[PDB]
């Protein structure tokens, strides 16, 4: 059946983001669309489920020279006393049937955590210890020793923006939307490209997807510079170099791992 066609129509306009990027892969005629998707009331309903007799009646009494309002009228319509008990037990039984479809841890080296991932004679201790011991026998020099006009002033100058220890542009905005669209464009297609890359997949069926994806990387990126060229040749300002890293670094991973494959063979 044409299940895919119906799904596309539902998402044709309901959600822009999903369809917006899918077309872009075909706007420039990059690759076939087959690989795109291949890789990636209540009251009447209750009576419909609850009472089998109504279900049978509805099929046999399907609207024919009648009205739904008239059908609604038919719903509500000592021996009579027993009917309520039988109906409720039957009704309760039907509802019930309706909802029933047929290690102590241990370690060898805990010191490693104490000196964790963060990376990096004897007489000197004695000599230093004694010298400091006799240092503070004179104390409370606060009057002048703590600060001086020259020393204090130098600190203020350093704290100024020009001074040391105090080091200290949204011009493009319309272009921002295109980059975000491009960013989603790269992310949407990189995801599939990186979907199988981390896993080695030593199998032809899984590896074939890698080759198709690996070749597809060039195809999607073949058209990328063309869009880049137009944007770049505007004011030569606010260069977009990050977007290149993902593609170039994707190439390097592709080329390196592809080269590694030959060595393994």
């Amino acid at each position: 059946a044409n299940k895919e066609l119906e799904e596309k129509n539902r998402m044709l306009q309901e959600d822009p983001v999903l369809f917006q990027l899918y077309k872009d892969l075909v706007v420039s005629q990059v690759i076939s669309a087959e690989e795109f998707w291949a890789n990636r009331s209540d009251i009447i309903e209750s009576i419909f489920r609850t009472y089998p007799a109504v279900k049978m009646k509805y099929a046999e009494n399907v609207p024919h020279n009648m009205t739904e309002k008239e059908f609604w009228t038919r719903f509500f319509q000592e021996n009579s006393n027993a009917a309520i008990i039988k109906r409720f037990n039957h009704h309760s039984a039907m509802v019930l049937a309706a909802g029933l479809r047929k290690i102590a841890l241990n370690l060898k080296k805990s010191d490693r955590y104490y000196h964790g991932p963060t990376p990096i004679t004897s007489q000197d201790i004695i000599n230093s210890f004694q010298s400091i011991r006799q240092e503070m026998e004179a104390y409370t020099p606060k009057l002048t020793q703590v600060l001086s006009s020259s020393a204090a002033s130098s600190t203020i100058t350093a704290l100024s923006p020009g001074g040391a220890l105090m080091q200290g542009q949204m011009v493009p905005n319309d272009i921002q939307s295109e980059l975000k669209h491009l960013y989603v464009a790269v992310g949407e297609l990189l995801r599939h490209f990186w979907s199988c890359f981390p896993v080695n997949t030593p199998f032809l069926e899984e590896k074939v997807v890698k080759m198709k994806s690996n070749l597809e990387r060039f195809q999607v990126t073949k058209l990328c510079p063309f869009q880049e060229k137009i944007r770049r040749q505007y004011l030569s300002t606010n260069l977009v170099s990050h977007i290149e890293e993902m593609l170039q670094t994707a190439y390097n991973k592709l080329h390196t791992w592809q080269s590694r494959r030959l060595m393994k063979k």
């Binding site: 290690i103 980059l179 990189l190 606010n238 260069l239 890293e245």
Partner: protein
């Protein structure tokens, strides 16, 4: 006991009408939402590598309020929005569990799957039988630990014990914080549960090289403006505003060094300190930890350092600091 360092827990909340009833001081639904915010905020604060996903089940339908994520701010925002939720309908445990199972079915083996169901209305109308689902959960090694509200319902009683989780009921609002607070800690991994190594990458924060020379402009990765500097990836090479976020491309978890060091206190729990009220030859009137006079007949000591800690120090050390001050020496 070895614990599950990385866990994917779902906080299923019932949108039942019974939540409308106010047995507690505020509206029951608001209170759970108010307190659930504490758990969500605290949950990541004591387990960064983990991730959470909330589900709300109302009118016999289970709708994923938020997918699995590592940002407590996003989840908390949904909680604020859910405060004004209609809260009219009947929950369906089968719908809720089924929704969680689908998402959690594809999770990696190393992670410790979990679910926390805040049960309020004792009734549970479901499209199909749940015992078949219960069997699937055990084969799916999903730990479901319901937290009932005002009911020791049998259906959940088997669920928690049969599936390996824990069942509880809210004695009062104050007791409610204790129950959820217990689930914050990584539950121990049982015999059935297994473990495996997980790949991760540490994103070195980078800024402009030298006065905007060879700059790296970009906006974000999930109205973000251009950013001079941001976290990158060993493989994505994508600018991530904040950490820890799973690679939107690689699928590999990115996490800074401190976050991993945050959870080490779980591995090495501090041994409790014996409480002796009398002085017992303790000649230090001032507490060693806080250098404050002991106005109570209470003292705490270690088995190695053998120091003195008042009630305030011991309460603090075992609550937040998760280490003995003096015994570090």
């Amino acid at each position: 006991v070895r614990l599950g360092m990385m866990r994917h827990l779902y906080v299923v909340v019932d949108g039942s009408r019974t939540m409308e009833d106010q047995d507690l001081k505020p509206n029951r639904l608001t209170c759970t939402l108010k307190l659930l915010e504490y758990f969500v905020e605290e949950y990541f604060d004591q387990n960064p590598i983990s991730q959470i996903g909330i589900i709300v089940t109302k009118s016999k339908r289970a709708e994923k309020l938020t997918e699995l994520s590592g940002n407590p701010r996003k989840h908390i925002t949904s909680l604020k929005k859910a405060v004004d939720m209609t809260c009219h309908g009947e929950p369906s445990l089968y719908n809720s569990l089924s929704i969680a199972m689908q998402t959690l079915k594809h999770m990696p083996g190393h992670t410790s799957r979990e679910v926390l169901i805040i049960f309020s209305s004792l009734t549970t109308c479901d499209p199909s039988n749940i015992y078949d689902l219960i069997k699937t959960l055990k084969a799916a090694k999903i730990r479901v630990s319901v937290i009932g509200l005002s009911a020791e319902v049998r259906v959940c009683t088997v669920l928690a014990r049969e599936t390996g989780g824990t069942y509880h009921v809210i004695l009062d609002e104050s007791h409610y914080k204790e129950l959820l607070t217990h689930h914050v800690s990584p539950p121990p991994a049982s015999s059935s549960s297994e473990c495996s190594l997980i790949r991760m990458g540490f994103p070195q924060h980078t800024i402009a090289s030298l006065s905007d020379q060879d700059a790296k402009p970009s906006f974000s990765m999930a109205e973000p403006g251009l950013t001079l500097g941001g976290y990158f990836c060993p493989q994505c090479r994508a600018k991530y505003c904040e950490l820890p976020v799973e690679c939107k491309i690689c699928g590999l978890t990115l996490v800074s060094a401190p976050h991993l060091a945050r959870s080490y206190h779980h591995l090495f729990p501090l041994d409790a300190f014996q409480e002796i009220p009398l002085e017992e030859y303790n000649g230090e009137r001032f507490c060693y930890g806080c250098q404050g006079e002991l106005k109570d007949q209470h003292v705490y000591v270690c088995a190695v350092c053998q120091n003195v800690f008042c009630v305030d120090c011991d309460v603090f050390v075992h609550d937040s600091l998760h280490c003995c001050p003096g015994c570090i020496h």
